[PDB]
Amino acid sequence: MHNYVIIDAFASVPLEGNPVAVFFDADDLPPAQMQRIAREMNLSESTFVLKPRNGGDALIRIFTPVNELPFAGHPLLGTAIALGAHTDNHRLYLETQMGTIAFELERQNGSVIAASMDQPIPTWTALGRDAELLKALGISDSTFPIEIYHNGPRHVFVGLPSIDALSALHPDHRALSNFHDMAINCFAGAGRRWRSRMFSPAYGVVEDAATGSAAGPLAIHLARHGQIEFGQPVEILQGVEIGRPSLMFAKAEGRAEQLTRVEVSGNGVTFGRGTIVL
Amino acid sequence: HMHNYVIIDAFASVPLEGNPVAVFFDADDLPPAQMQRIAREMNLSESTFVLKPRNGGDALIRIFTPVNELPFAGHPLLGTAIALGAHTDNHRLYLETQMGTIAFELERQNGSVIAASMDQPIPTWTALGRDAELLKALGISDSTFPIEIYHNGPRHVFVGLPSIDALSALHPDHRALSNFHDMAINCFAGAGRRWRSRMFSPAYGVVEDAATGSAAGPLAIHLARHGQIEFGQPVEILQGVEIGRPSLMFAKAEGRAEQLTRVEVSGNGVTFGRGTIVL
Ligand SMILES: N[C@H]1C(C(=O)O)=CC=C[C@@H]1O
Ligand SMILES: N[C@H]1C(C(=O)O)=CC=C[C@@H]1O
């Protein structure tokens, strides 16, 4: 029987942010069973904590309702906050299929409030399917070039000219299903403060509340297209329209041709805790 | 303030099959606006909230999808009955809802509730009258029977498919279906005592539901009305296969079209997990 905790990632009060279910002592579970348990929980992702194989503190497998991912931001954030309660450490190294991800935990009197990660440095290229994507989304143009970024999963970015225009999107989900192994991230804002919405049939979600692996790439995207400075911290607020406001903090250091660090951080809180029968 | 919950997989005998529901105990201190938010947090087709009774039943149950409250629903109440069945020795349970009190008969094996049967509200029905629009949204050109909508709290439309292969081949346009408010679209195929279903409902916050217990009773009526079975004949409705959540519902509608005397729906259920929440 496995214990789990529900963490609300990128939130400072339960019922805000993006839930993840974090399953402990999962070494006895076959990957097909992990996928079934993820399907059962029906959250954007469930994670499984396994003994480390390469010098980290643990190995984390990450599942959507429909597939496994090699890296993801919100689920690893919540996993790191949940696992922080197990030890006194303020540095935590979590293994994933993209490599070992370093975390710094914000603790008060030993109690975990928040965490910060160094993400894999993404690569990118032009999407090459603009007219198809924009038709699906129900709009005419992107404010900036439409590019697709890879850090494990893939994330496409489409810019909107106002927050009201972002909120008014009603995408064709069936048409977005033609975009395999990627999530579609639509953004609007100014300066240090940005809003986002994410849609991904490929990753089993109509609309996601907090796409943490997209936050670091967005910071890169905004700097490459001259809207912010490299090294400038940004706030990205996602999930407002669906009633799940989630605050992600991101900073990309270096320059377009040579990035040195892609940091994403947030608060997280425990919503609940329990046990499953298998 | 803290609340205990159980996850019941309804219309299944083993975990990871059927349709999950989260059942929250001693929920009187939660305002409906907070219940709605908890249901979204769980993200299951429904969560239910167990309140003290007001009209001589055992409990009053409020039922929420991820986006709205419903006055009655089958799967969530089956799971609620099985969960509450662990706390009692009684053979029957009476659950108050916005639709009235729903009677359940509990089935035990060893010391343990493994299944239950409910008497549902008797539905009303009519044609939907929007065949062209609905069929377009579904991606097909007609239905094998008249397209009709039944009301037992929620509303359920039925669209018939000529084969199970044709049913599994549906790839509906969720956005176009969102123009159908306050209803679920139930697509069916099969023969005799054996039927397959798929349900789609942007109105009730689900792309595709695994087991729509409030649709099982009405489908039995619809099949009888349209001469595919006899009134009083029990049927087996298998839902959720294409999404990896196979769920078996048993239904019987007794009487005649002009006067239904009982609409019974039953099924197995099993506990998948339990826990506590911080509000
Ligand atoms: N939570 C999202 C995610 C993330 O990085 O948080 C990656 C891919 C899809 C999930 O819905
Ligand atoms: N499980 C379904 C339900 C039911 O009766 O089980 C009614 C309406 C929509 C839900 O997804």
XYZ file of C-alpha atoms and ligand atoms in Angstrom:
579
model
C 0.000 0.000 0.000
C 1.531 3.361 -0.956
C 1.429 6.669 0.821
C 0.910 9.842 -1.212
C 0.700 13.606 -0.687
C -1.187 16.149 -2.785
C 0.895 19.289 -3.264
C -0.454 22.485 -4.723
C 2.562 23.670 -6.716
C 3.184 27.361 -7.540
C 0.794 28.369 -4.716
C 0.892 29.831 -1.188
C -2.680 28.526 -0.148
C -4.466 25.256 -0.853
C -6.884 25.203 -3.862
C -4.638 27.610 -5.822
C -1.756 26.418 -8.072
C -1.544 23.065 -9.834
C -2.032 19.849 -7.914
C 0.411 16.937 -8.135
C 0.084 13.603 -6.412
C 3.547 12.404 -5.135
C 3.761 8.620 -4.418
C 6.359 7.350 -1.938
C 8.378 4.080 -1.836
C 7.371 3.251 -5.383
C 10.212 0.789 -6.208
C 7.846 -2.196 -6.300
C 5.614 -0.646 -8.944
C 6.109 -1.547 -12.650
C 6.008 1.441 -14.994
C 2.778 0.214 -16.617
C 1.162 0.322 -13.146
C 2.525 3.836 -12.481
C 0.846 4.935 -15.698
C -2.455 3.375 -14.577
C -2.260 5.116 -11.183
C -1.650 8.425 -12.992
C -4.739 7.784 -15.115
C -6.684 7.029 -11.892
C -5.647 10.258 -10.158
C -6.420 12.315 -13.337
C -4.249 15.277 -12.280
C -1.978 16.907 -14.886
C 0.799 14.677 -13.478
C 1.496 12.114 -10.705
C 5.080 11.308 -9.665
C 6.783 8.247 -8.199
C 9.732 8.417 -5.767
C 12.364 5.711 -6.382
C 15.810 4.917 -5.045
C 18.551 6.884 -6.831
C 20.689 5.224 -9.539
C 23.264 7.968 -10.230
C 24.162 9.786 -7.027
C 21.029 11.919 -6.522
C 18.792 11.841 -3.478
C 16.092 10.041 -5.444
C 14.901 9.097 -8.912
C 11.505 10.569 -9.903
C 9.307 9.149 -12.685
C 6.688 11.602 -14.019
C 3.367 10.556 -15.659
C 0.460 12.446 -17.211
C -2.866 10.642 -17.486
C -1.742 9.342 -20.918
C 2.079 9.215 -21.123
C 5.419 9.426 -19.320
C 7.521 12.615 -19.460
C 11.308 12.845 -19.076
C 11.172 16.225 -17.252
C 8.407 18.560 -16.003
C 8.516 21.689 -13.755
C 5.382 21.710 -11.561
C 5.555 18.004 -10.669
C 9.232 18.147 -9.684
C 8.640 21.345 -7.725
C 5.913 19.666 -5.734
C 7.966 16.462 -5.349
C 10.896 18.448 -3.984
C 8.651 20.304 -1.489
C 7.051 16.951 -0.359
C 10.452 15.189 -0.048
C 11.912 18.148 1.792
C 9.934 17.079 4.819
C 11.877 13.762 4.963
C 15.317 15.353 5.707
C 16.979 18.516 7.010
C 18.764 19.270 3.714
C 18.380 22.545 1.920
C 19.941 21.181 -1.241
C 18.212 18.322 -3.009
C 19.263 16.532 -6.255
C 16.481 14.740 -8.108
C 17.275 12.339 -10.918
C 15.054 12.302 -14.024
C 15.311 10.913 -17.575
C 16.802 14.343 -18.576
C 19.503 14.099 -15.874
C 19.972 15.187 -12.288
C 18.097 18.409 -11.375
C 19.415 20.562 -8.554
C 16.933 22.177 -6.069
C 17.406 24.763 -3.319
C 14.638 24.521 -0.647
C 13.321 27.556 1.280
C 12.819 26.400 4.842
C 11.733 28.137 8.046
C 12.557 26.379 11.293
C 13.042 23.177 9.143
C 9.635 23.579 7.432
C 9.593 23.739 3.570
C 7.801 26.796 1.993
C 9.225 26.923 -1.501
C 11.853 25.659 -3.935
C 14.034 26.734 -6.823
C 15.355 24.459 -9.677
C 17.979 24.709 -12.378
C 16.268 23.381 -15.540
C 17.861 21.755 -18.571
C 18.945 24.368 -21.088
C 16.422 24.103 -23.902
C 17.066 24.095 -27.668
C 14.587 25.614 -30.145
C 13.537 26.086 -33.725
C 10.733 27.584 -35.783
C 7.467 25.630 -35.589
C 6.834 25.801 -39.361
C 3.055 25.282 -38.936
C 1.826 28.783 -38.073
C -1.349 28.987 -40.090
C -2.544 25.547 -38.810
C -1.840 26.411 -35.177
C -3.331 29.889 -35.260
C -6.513 28.541 -36.948
C -6.857 25.916 -34.211
C -6.403 28.651 -31.537
C -8.948 30.844 -33.290
C -6.682 33.807 -34.008
C -5.013 35.700 -36.831
C -1.370 36.291 -35.805
C 1.180 35.881 -32.996
C 2.771 39.046 -31.630
C 6.210 37.306 -31.847
C 7.666 34.464 -33.997
C 6.182 31.046 -33.144
C 8.986 28.840 -31.869
C 9.131 25.376 -30.249
C 11.471 24.672 -27.337
C 12.742 21.287 -26.083
C 13.811 20.502 -22.514
C 12.320 16.982 -22.382
C 8.781 17.806 -23.276
C 8.286 20.422 -25.959
C 6.616 23.858 -25.624
C 5.393 26.182 -28.369
C 4.900 29.898 -27.593
C 2.187 32.145 -29.185
C 1.997 35.797 -28.133
C -1.302 37.621 -27.551
C -1.728 41.467 -27.683
C -3.613 41.854 -24.394
C -4.616 39.880 -21.340
C -8.274 40.237 -22.491
C -7.415 38.621 -25.837
C -5.618 35.776 -23.977
C -8.671 35.202 -21.747
C -11.002 35.207 -24.735
C -9.294 32.190 -26.395
C -11.573 29.172 -26.945
C -9.260 26.758 -28.856
C -10.311 23.802 -31.069
C -8.931 20.943 -28.850
C -9.488 18.385 -31.622
C -7.463 20.501 -34.022
C -4.720 20.937 -31.345
C -4.565 17.074 -31.147
C -2.697 17.147 -34.494
C 0.243 18.731 -32.591
C 1.961 15.675 -31.083
C 4.521 15.588 -28.240
C 4.088 19.288 -27.380
C 2.170 21.793 -25.291
C 0.836 25.101 -26.631
C 1.615 28.090 -24.378
C -0.194 31.408 -25.171
C 1.165 34.509 -23.365
C 0.456 38.211 -22.758
C 1.879 40.951 -20.535
C 4.631 43.537 -20.137
C 7.925 43.960 -18.382
C 8.320 41.844 -15.265
C 4.690 40.545 -15.275
C 3.254 38.062 -17.699
C 0.162 35.919 -17.976
C -0.087 32.489 -19.615
C -2.498 29.738 -20.611
C -1.426 26.177 -21.699
C -3.287 23.640 -23.802
C -2.010 20.081 -24.482
C -4.003 17.132 -25.881
C -0.638 15.426 -26.404
C -0.018 15.477 -22.645
C -3.600 14.603 -21.655
C -4.846 18.010 -20.523
C -7.410 20.414 -22.033
C -5.881 23.308 -20.075
C -3.118 23.133 -17.476
C -2.893 25.444 -14.418
C 0.969 25.781 -14.127
C 3.407 24.515 -16.768
C 6.667 24.818 -14.953
C 8.852 23.447 -17.791
C 7.435 26.249 -19.932
C 8.358 29.076 -17.533
C 12.095 28.907 -18.128
C 11.701 28.720 -21.939
C 9.303 31.675 -21.869
C 11.886 33.802 -20.046
C 14.308 32.855 -22.839
C 11.676 33.631 -25.562
C 10.925 37.093 -24.087
C 14.631 38.028 -23.885
C 15.383 36.698 -27.445
C 12.612 38.914 -28.717
C 13.754 41.989 -26.892
C 10.887 42.424 -24.381
C 13.070 41.806 -21.279
C 16.817 41.597 -20.453
C 18.682 38.301 -19.989
C 19.116 37.860 -16.241
C 15.900 39.810 -15.466
C 13.519 37.851 -13.210
C 9.897 37.570 -14.379
C 6.641 36.527 -12.817
C 4.385 34.328 -14.922
C 0.812 33.999 -13.761
C -1.028 30.986 -15.269
C -4.415 29.331 -14.731
C -6.471 32.407 -13.813
C -9.371 31.679 -16.235
C -9.816 28.150 -14.911
C -9.793 29.235 -11.250
C -6.327 27.880 -10.509
C -4.088 30.939 -10.338
C -0.438 29.812 -10.232
C 2.599 32.067 -9.775
C 5.863 30.912 -11.440
C 9.111 32.845 -11.041
C 11.733 32.431 -13.848
C 15.161 33.838 -14.718
C 17.386 32.889 -17.782
C 21.053 33.921 -17.377
C 23.683 34.400 -20.157
C 22.914 35.162 -23.798
C 20.872 33.588 -26.614
C 23.846 31.583 -28.045
C 25.155 30.688 -24.606
C 22.757 30.310 -21.702
C 24.371 29.539 -18.372
C 21.340 28.923 -16.146
C 17.529 28.593 -16.387
C 16.066 28.907 -12.877
C 12.348 28.322 -12.106
C 10.973 28.677 -8.595
C 7.729 28.810 -6.623
C 5.887 28.239 -3.409
C 3.967 25.042 -2.745
C 1.624 23.774 -0.023
C 0.179 20.481 1.102
C -3.515 19.970 0.261
C -3.865 16.445 1.622
C -2.333 13.129 2.403
C -3.395 9.497 2.220
C -2.804 5.934 1.078
C -3.721 3.818 -1.934
C -4.616 0.070 -1.768
C -1.887 -1.067 -4.202
C -10.988 22.475 9.756
C -9.987 19.102 8.088
C -12.015 16.457 6.152
C -11.508 12.738 5.610
C -12.223 11.244 2.148
C -12.415 7.888 0.408
C -11.736 7.210 -3.443
C -14.254 4.677 -4.657
C -13.958 3.170 -8.123
C -17.663 2.819 -9.026
C -18.954 0.152 -11.503
C -15.839 -2.045 -11.018
C -14.902 -5.054 -8.737
C -11.046 -4.238 -9.007
C -9.125 -1.014 -8.477
C -8.065 1.044 -11.459
C -11.187 0.074 -13.400
C -14.654 1.827 -13.291
C -15.108 5.552 -12.633
C -13.542 7.166 -9.537
C -15.436 9.342 -7.089
C -14.004 11.223 -4.076
C -16.420 11.143 -1.052
C -15.889 13.752 1.669
C -17.225 12.973 5.114
C -18.656 15.456 7.727
C -18.798 18.193 5.154
C -21.415 20.496 6.782
C -18.866 23.206 7.594
C -17.981 23.700 3.881
C -19.834 26.350 1.936
C -20.964 25.262 -1.579
C -18.427 27.608 -3.162
C -15.613 25.737 -1.326
C -17.132 22.318 -2.209
C -16.991 23.375 -5.873
C -13.295 24.300 -5.483
C -12.481 20.961 -3.828
C -14.164 19.128 -6.661
C -11.908 20.986 -9.118
C -8.863 20.190 -6.987
C -9.669 16.437 -7.151
C -10.393 16.716 -10.894
C -12.489 13.531 -10.937
C -15.744 13.450 -12.916
C -17.472 14.129 -9.545
C -16.744 14.591 -5.865
C -19.507 14.266 -3.233
C -20.027 15.857 0.167
C -21.808 14.054 3.040
C -24.067 16.345 5.110
C -26.410 15.684 8.043
C -29.947 14.669 6.896
C -32.947 17.118 6.863
C -35.878 14.893 5.684
C -35.463 11.540 7.458
C -32.814 9.851 5.308
C -29.415 8.639 6.488
C -27.496 11.614 4.959
C -27.915 14.485 2.521
C -25.431 14.355 -0.443
C -24.237 17.313 -2.533
C -22.607 16.438 -5.891
C -20.156 18.506 -7.906
C -18.348 18.094 -11.231
C -15.134 20.024 -11.720
C -17.238 22.986 -12.958
C -20.825 22.759 -11.559
C -23.219 21.235 -9.038
C -25.728 18.485 -10.086
C -28.990 17.554 -8.371
C -28.590 13.821 -8.956
C -25.992 11.485 -10.479
C -25.553 7.707 -10.587
C -21.811 6.813 -10.291
C -21.158 9.395 -7.475
C -24.105 8.169 -5.451
C -23.218 4.507 -5.958
C -19.740 5.241 -4.725
C -21.125 7.349 -1.870
C -23.420 4.469 -0.828
C -20.586 1.931 -0.881
C -18.362 4.268 1.181
C -21.078 4.945 3.809
C -21.897 1.275 3.791
C -18.596 0.640 5.612
C -19.879 2.662 8.615
C -23.153 0.639 9.084
C -24.675 -2.871 9.281
C -27.995 -1.836 7.627
C -29.096 -3.507 4.344
C -30.603 -0.304 2.923
C -29.406 3.268 2.816
C -31.427 6.397 2.106
C -29.557 9.324 0.537
C -31.236 12.661 0.291
C -30.490 14.792 -2.774
C -31.908 17.839 -4.555
C -34.037 15.270 -6.553
C -35.488 13.636 -3.411
C -34.428 10.679 -1.330
C -32.679 7.856 -3.251
C -33.055 4.326 -1.833
C -30.141 1.905 -2.067
C -29.806 -1.795 -1.307
C -26.278 -2.747 -0.209
C -24.657 -6.096 -0.971
C -22.095 -7.477 1.414
C -19.607 -10.372 1.020
C -17.656 -11.421 4.088
C -17.819 -8.201 6.235
C -17.784 -5.941 3.293
C -19.989 -3.865 0.980
C -19.047 -4.901 -2.574
C -22.034 -3.559 -4.556
C -25.294 -1.721 -4.518
C -28.562 -1.105 -6.342
C -30.471 2.214 -6.501
C -33.949 3.303 -7.545
C -33.451 6.373 -9.732
C -35.874 9.257 -10.318
C -38.303 8.464 -13.193
C -37.166 10.574 -16.149
C -38.993 12.731 -18.603
C -37.990 12.765 -22.249
C -38.374 14.412 -25.586
C -36.615 14.773 -28.925
C -33.635 17.112 -28.861
C -34.615 18.729 -32.168
C -31.022 19.729 -33.037
C -30.000 16.596 -34.996
C -28.049 18.318 -37.673
C -25.953 20.345 -35.249
C -25.311 17.443 -32.841
C -24.417 14.898 -35.543
C -21.961 17.391 -37.055
C -20.268 17.855 -33.726
C -19.999 14.034 -33.330
C -18.603 13.674 -36.842
C -21.348 11.369 -38.161
C -24.402 11.598 -40.459
C -27.215 10.015 -38.523
C -28.460 8.007 -35.590
C -29.935 4.497 -35.586
C -32.841 5.679 -33.407
C -34.588 8.993 -32.727
C -32.232 11.409 -30.884
C -33.916 12.040 -27.555
C -33.012 13.793 -24.274
C -33.985 12.440 -20.877
C -34.079 14.421 -17.551
C -33.549 12.887 -14.125
C -31.739 15.906 -12.644
C -29.007 16.112 -15.141
C -29.957 15.582 -18.825
C -28.755 12.760 -21.121
C -29.058 12.671 -24.941
C -28.852 9.281 -26.739
C -27.307 8.800 -30.255
C -27.242 5.264 -31.684
C -24.369 3.822 -33.646
C -24.654 0.893 -36.134
C -21.625 -1.059 -34.726
C -19.134 -1.060 -31.835
C -16.368 -0.316 -34.376
C -18.309 2.837 -35.457
C -18.752 3.799 -31.798
C -15.006 3.431 -31.037
C -14.179 5.445 -34.160
C -15.886 8.642 -32.889
C -13.517 11.613 -32.456
C -15.969 14.410 -31.451
C -15.400 18.154 -31.594
C -15.473 19.065 -27.858
C -15.758 22.803 -28.678
C -18.841 22.330 -30.867
C -20.332 20.086 -28.208
C -19.943 22.932 -25.666
C -22.924 24.614 -27.391
C -25.038 21.873 -25.784
C -25.637 23.254 -22.298
C -26.691 21.335 -19.238
C -26.481 17.888 -20.813
C -24.271 14.886 -21.625
C -24.118 13.164 -25.002
C -24.316 9.357 -24.651
C -23.424 7.319 -27.783
C -24.374 3.649 -27.777
C -24.125 0.380 -29.799
C -24.774 -3.313 -29.194
C -27.684 -5.761 -29.098
C -30.058 -7.590 -26.754
C -28.677 -7.685 -23.165
C -25.243 -6.262 -24.173
C -24.546 -2.571 -24.870
C -21.473 -0.358 -25.161
C -21.560 3.410 -24.401
C -19.324 6.469 -24.665
C -20.233 9.766 -22.918
C -19.002 13.288 -23.765
C -19.947 16.437 -21.777
C -18.141 19.865 -21.823
C -21.241 21.099 -19.917
C -20.417 18.759 -16.983
C -16.695 19.396 -17.248
C -15.548 16.071 -18.799
C -14.150 15.392 -22.290
C -15.169 11.716 -21.870
C -16.674 10.075 -18.780
C -15.951 6.456 -17.785
C -19.336 5.504 -16.299
C -22.499 7.680 -16.416
C -24.777 5.962 -13.911
C -27.621 8.507 -14.413
C -27.575 7.590 -18.146
C -27.896 3.802 -17.569
C -31.566 3.936 -16.407
C -32.724 6.202 -19.247
C -30.892 4.018 -21.850
C -32.748 0.957 -20.644
C -36.015 2.941 -21.114
C -34.942 4.192 -24.565
C -34.022 0.678 -25.745
C -37.397 -0.627 -24.514
C -39.288 2.245 -26.118
C -37.592 1.489 -29.408
C -38.301 -2.302 -29.372
C -34.710 -3.545 -28.859
C -35.538 -5.089 -25.466
C -38.718 -5.644 -23.410
C -39.619 -3.537 -20.391
C -38.360 -5.300 -17.289
C -35.433 -6.976 -19.196
C -32.052 -6.327 -17.427
C -29.206 -5.046 -19.557
C -25.429 -4.722 -19.177
C -23.901 -1.418 -20.306
C -20.139 -1.327 -20.757
C -18.632 2.210 -20.811
C -15.133 3.655 -20.841
C -13.300 0.998 -22.934
C -11.657 3.441 -25.387
C -10.244 5.568 -22.591
C -8.853 2.644 -20.593
C -11.479 2.774 -17.864
C -13.899 -0.168 -18.532
C -16.998 0.124 -16.315
C -20.010 -2.253 -16.103
C -23.480 -0.848 -15.273
C -26.581 -3.052 -14.833
C -29.996 -1.422 -15.498
C -33.716 -2.472 -15.653
C -36.778 -0.221 -16.328
C -40.095 -1.691 -15.177
C -43.677 -0.910 -16.196
C -44.622 0.709 -19.532
C -43.706 3.938 -21.302
C -46.879 5.724 -20.010
C -46.200 4.562 -16.409
C -42.696 3.474 -15.219
C -42.855 1.903 -11.819
C -39.101 1.463 -11.170
C -35.822 2.419 -12.868
C -33.105 0.345 -11.149
C -29.324 0.742 -11.719
C -26.695 -1.342 -9.945
C -23.024 -2.127 -9.864
C -19.911 -3.241 -8.024
C -17.521 -0.818 -6.331
C -14.149 -0.977 -4.619
C -11.947 1.382 -2.541
C -8.844 2.650 -4.296
C -7.578 4.963 -1.544
C -8.355 7.211 1.371
C -6.983 10.214 3.209
C -7.407 13.608 4.827
C -7.380 17.224 3.603
C -6.232 20.388 5.343
C -9.476 22.312 4.998
N 2.178 20.453 -15.718
C 2.626 20.361 -17.158
C 4.144 20.278 -17.358
C 5.016 21.078 -16.417
O 6.188 21.239 -16.750
O 4.590 21.441 -15.323
C 4.756 19.686 -18.494
C 3.950 19.096 -19.455
C 2.569 19.044 -19.293
C 1.931 19.227 -17.888
O 0.540 19.489 -17.964
N -20.377 10.426 -14.040
C -21.301 11.346 -14.733
C -22.717 11.380 -14.128
C -23.266 10.085 -13.540
O -24.501 9.922 -13.430
O -22.498 9.222 -13.116
C -23.619 12.422 -14.475
C -23.171 13.540 -15.196
C -21.825 13.677 -15.623
C -20.742 12.769 -14.928
O -19.524 12.775 -15.670
